[PDB]
């Protein structure tokens, strides 16, 4: 969808990008050894203990659930309709970054 009106108000110009990637459901994937960047939306090799090809030394994994909600029900004030647009709840369990082998966040804006 085309924008009606963005505005970069004295931002760093890199600060503006990763505040605009957060609102677009994309991440950067920067590549060294080139000037090519593949921006791709948030959506295998099978390294195993038995496998000879890759030698492992340490596997740290944190598994936190403090800052992980389940909903993100966000909504905002529609100027034309004045209904405070219907709550678009997002289910948890879509886009699972950790898939194992074996609280509801909600804001409302005045805009």
């Amino acid at each position: 969808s085309k924008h009606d009106q963005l505005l970069q108000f004295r931002l760093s110009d890199w600060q503006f990008i990763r505040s605009r990637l957060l609102s677009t459901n994309c991440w950067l994937l920067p590549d060294a050894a080139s000037d090519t960047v593949v921006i791709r939306p948030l959506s295998s090799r099978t390294l195993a203990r038995d496998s000879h090809d890759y030698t492992l030394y340490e596997i740290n994994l944190n598994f936190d659930n403090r800052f992980t909600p389940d909903s993100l029900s966000l909504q905002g004030w529609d100027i034309a309709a004045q209904r405070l647009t219907a709550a678009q709840k997002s289910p948890a369990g879509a886009f699972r970054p950790w898939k194992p082998a074996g609280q509801d966040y909600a804001l409302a804006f005045s805009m």
Binding site: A48, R49, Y54, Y57, I59
Partner: protein, 57 residues
């Protein structure tokens, strides 16, 4: 041997740079050492890999 029976002492030459361009002094020492010894040593570290397929260092 094969020509004559005179001794050959050891000579300690010195420089100043890494190469041979700038010679410092140079002495030959009488009364040869009776025994030299040159020790080699190579350091290895064992791989403590978690996969336990192989033992290596």
């Amino acid at each position: 041997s094969l020509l004559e029976r005179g001794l050959s002492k050891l000579t300690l030459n010195a420089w100043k740079d890494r190469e041979g361009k700038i010679p410092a002094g140079s002495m030959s020492a009488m009364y040869n050492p009776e025994t030299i010894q040159l020790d080699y040593q190579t350091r290895f570290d064992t791989e403590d890999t978690i996969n336990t397929a192989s033992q290596s260092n």
